[PDB]
Symmetry: C3
Subunit: 317 residues, 3 copies
């Protein structure tokens, strides 16, 4: 009988039924470091071109917005586009035998322009449907074989997190004072180091960083706060985990990976022009979840409220 | 008497008091499709101008940041601005009879520059207060009558959501494998289709897409997760709803609609210049709320704790 | 004895144990107003330069993304950078006595380029390690003494918040209809005014706006919703508080303040060039927390469930 009430008291102790718990408030500030040297050969419009250059922080990333940041790992440039008419890029949907194959005004999800209803030669007696759009249309080409910014895994993101508990008067930050900032997070050797190498993140989740860096993906950093605001036992430290939020579908229809089309408008020869940059990379979403706990009498009097009935039926047997 | 305890047991079953519930973690990835052909006539500075051009994804949208994305539906361009002095645009506040009407250094919330304290002619013996700013000052003109990118309603946003339950070992995604991705969400015909036409969203909420697209607004996509992590009955699917978060005030003071001023800096003739683009559109905020539920003994022993007292008083009558 | 049951009933009344509480859904829309006149003298590469110009909304801010916005308060420009080789900027780590001091391919976290392994003169027989990068390398210089956009504190952010309670059928907005929008938030004189002067925010938190505006920081706006969805007593208004989320470390290693490196690519003389803008400012994170409360029988029958045991043991004494 009494051991049953020690099981109730156990449920209280271990389940922290005596504590009030409150959802944590998270603010995030991330600063990434590293530079990537890009020397590769890439064929554009059937002509080989040499891509050489250095990429510093400004060239491959922007500031954190909404608790997530992005790291361009690959890209494709289509310079000199300008408003006009041009034959769409040859694909199963763009290729026409005669003017009747193209319907004027038609626009297909794969096309970047509105059809003109006319069939015209793209190259060497091979005709696609003419469209109106930014010309010439970007190639329906795959990303470079090895990701141009393959060095991305060697980069290091420094994460600084500030968690607040409105219910209590308690606020704290990921980086406690006086810690040795020279470190690299390790599941075991540096569980509280806020410097994270990207390749390490991809290994922890068991995903090859290069593969994802070719077409892009969405990684995810989780920060757990099981904080105890009690004077007796008080613990409040983060728990870093890693999960690949990216879907990994691998189906043209579900737009696999992570990539977006960036536009850089400029004027040349009194003409309105636009360089189009298809950008691939990993987007890192930082997910911070917390629960603050303190001693509460009302919760112990309600838990007592249930335990006194449980006690009456326990004594009835 | 016993029917009272069947009412308690009912409250348990229907209220899921036996389950532990946990807040869901949401990651969002949105890819929008569609292109808008813009041919319209718009008067700038008293002179008619012809706006013709095609707008692809890159021209009217940027990537999702913070679980929300934006779709430019209208705009106004003020090309060639450069640092200098110019007479402010004529309005009830800018118009002066004499140099005494303007105070040097004064800046009014409607003005885009600091007054020079001098009264100067803007056009045809009509004087406004001279200011220092990007010159010439953007017209205090209304947005184009029909939204230039009125085609926006025909666009389709594909939403991909990944929800995780840290408490459990359970993670899932909006798009289950093998589904027919060729679809358009319908309240009844496609409750799980993640392709959403914008016009459909505006109809569901009962707002004309054109009206909002003229001056801009903030729409809102809600995704409900009432997931049951029990082995007996396990359900975990999203519930799409639509709500217009935009205020719809219609008062100059409350800055109605959604619009922002974008700056494009460029150099011409060894001069620093800036094209100013007032941008109008709908911002789409994706709100994902979830609750995961599993069987918990401590909660059933505490609910039992209350139900045994309720039982004692029920028997006392 | 009975006073004990009035203490239980008190815990019910004051703790609102009879109510079901639900987490609030927050949407935020912020429009900032103000313009800053920048006239200052700043030395670049050992030569004095005069920075004069006006800065309107477009020049110093972008739209809210993820419930936070940014206000550039200071900056440093490095115009004309272009891909090439150049001697790194002289610092304790870049300075070399001989070619042996530099290792080819080496890249240090402070460096913005990959070393060429060669020691070259930066200026006046003082040699740094040659690197490949955007040349010339940005100066390792401190921000301007008084923040160029020191006027930032006089700016006014208008915040418009829309909170929804999915559980109930209840939705509301920060700005109730018909209120006098002409106001400035005051802890006591305007607790519901949604116009916030920045300097006021920094004073409330007890931080000098100028100091933070020199190197940058992360401020934080909190909006409390302790809403009561009961018909008897119904209150649903926001509670504005201010907290400095910024860390304030003041250690080179922890990247103190708030600043990022922005890149503006342009072409000159058939050459690829890049103006680099180190941007400093305050990022304002808007934290909205809410709890909606209504009357619930199941919660009053479970609280009664605990209170009937508490009653039995109370009577046992
Ligand atoms: C990344 O760094 C490792 C050393 O940690 C090096 O062996 C490897 O070659 C580097 N890879 C790239 C692409 O820079
Ligand atoms: C930090 O740790 C590294 C070794 O990981 C050591 O070389 C360095 O001296 C330490 N610095 C401080 C300040 O403790
Ligand atoms: C949008 O598409 C519909 C067909 O679904 C068409 O009737 C309508 O004219 C289109 N409107 C615009 C502005 O493209
Ligand atoms: C998907 O559904 C459409 C009809 O809505 C049909 O035409 C198409 O063949 C289907 N595809 C698959 C793979 O089921
Ligand atoms: C800010 O405004 C105050 C008046 O409210 C004025 O006294 C002060 O000089 C202004 N400072 C700047 C930097 O504009
Ligand atoms: C708003 O209050 C100000 C004083 O703070 C007053 O001058 C103005 O007339 C008021 N406007 C309205 C519409 O109440």
């Amino acid at each position: 009988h009494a051991l049953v009430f020690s099981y109730i008291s156990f449920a209280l102790i271990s389940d922290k039924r005596y504590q009030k718990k409150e959802p944590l408030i998270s603010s995030v500030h991330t600063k990434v470091k590293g530079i990537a040297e890009v020397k590769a050969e890439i064929l554009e419009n059937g002509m080989k071109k040499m891509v050489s250059g250095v990429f510093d922080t400004a060239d491959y990333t922007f500031p954190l917005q909404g608790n997530s940041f992005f790291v361009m790992t690959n890209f494709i440039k289509t310079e000199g586009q300008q408003q006009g008419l041009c034959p769409d890029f040859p694909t199963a949907r763009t290729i026409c035998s005669s003017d009747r194959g193209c319907k004027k005004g038609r626009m297909d999800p794969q096309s970047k322009g509105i059809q003109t209803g006319r069939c015209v030669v793209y190259k060497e007696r091979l005709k696609t449907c003419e469209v109106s759009a930014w010309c010439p249309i970007e190639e329906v080409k795959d990303a470079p074989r090895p990701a141009l910014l393959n060095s991305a895994e060697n980069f290091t993101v420094l994460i600084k997190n500030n968690i607040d508990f409105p219910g209590h008067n308690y606020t704290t930050r990921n980086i406690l004072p006086g810690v040795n900032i020279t470190c690299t997070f390790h599941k075991t050797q540096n569980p509280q180091c806020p410097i994270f190498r990207l390749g390490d993140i991809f290994q922890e989740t068991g995903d090859s960083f290069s593969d994802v860096a070719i077409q892009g993906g969405i990684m995810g950093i989780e920060i757990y706060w099981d904080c105890n605001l009690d004077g007796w036992f008080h613990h409040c430290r983060p728990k870093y985990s890693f999960r690949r939020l990216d879907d990994k579908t691998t189906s043209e229809s579900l737009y696999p990976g992570y990539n977006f089309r960036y536009a850089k408008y400029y004027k040349e020869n009194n003409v309105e022009k636009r360089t189009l940059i298809k950008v691939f990379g990993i987007r890192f979403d930082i997910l911070v979840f917390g629960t603050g706990g303190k001693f509460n009498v009302i919760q112990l009097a309600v838990y007592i409220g249930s335990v006194i009935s449980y006690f009456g039926l326990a004594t009835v047997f």
